[PDB]
């Protein structure tokens, strides 16, 4: 309920096994507003708490680079990087039919 509580279940959440990674953007993304709300974040560094908590939720350990971001640079805005999260699961799908083909 108070600020400190809402971090720690923010920073706790993370991608459950069959979840995909834009509906875990999505699922966190409440939280996140809910924490610029109590004053837990500031307006200013929301973007980089975003993709700091993909980054430690996420399933896939080096999704960074998987989307092809680098360190230190900017952090993408939501819908950027939905986006980018978009075009990597596309990709992804690509692979897995070609995997189910070539097992033909």
Same mark, same amino acid.
């Given at each position: ?5 809402? /971090?720690?279940? #923010? !920073?706790?959440? #993370?991608?459950?096994? +069959?979840?995909? =990674?834009? *509906? #875990? ?9 809910? =924490? ?5 974040? +500031?307006?200013? *560094?929301?973007? /980089?708490?975003? !993709?700091?908590?993909?980054?430690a ?5 080096? @999704?960074?680079?998987?989307?092809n971001?680098? +360190? ?6 939501? !819908? /950027? !990087?939905?986006?980018? @999260?978009?075009? #990597?699961? *596309?990709?992804?799908?690509?692979? *897995? ?8």
């Amino acid at each position: 309920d108070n600020p400190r509580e809402l /971090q720690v279940k #923010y !920073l706790t959440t #993370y991608q459950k096994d +069959e979840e995909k =990674l834009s *509906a #875990y953007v999505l699922r966190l993304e409440p939280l996140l507003q809910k =924490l610029v709300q109590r004053g837990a974040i +500031e307006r200013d *560094a929301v973007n /980089q708490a975003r !993709l700091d908590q993909v980054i430690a939720g996420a399933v896939h350990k080096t @999704i960074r680079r998987e989307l092809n971001l680098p +360190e230190d640079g900017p952090a993408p805005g939501f !819908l /950027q !990087l939905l986006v980018l @999260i978009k075009d #990597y699961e *596309a990709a992804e799908e690509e692979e *897995a039919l070609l995997q189910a083909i070539l097992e033909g």
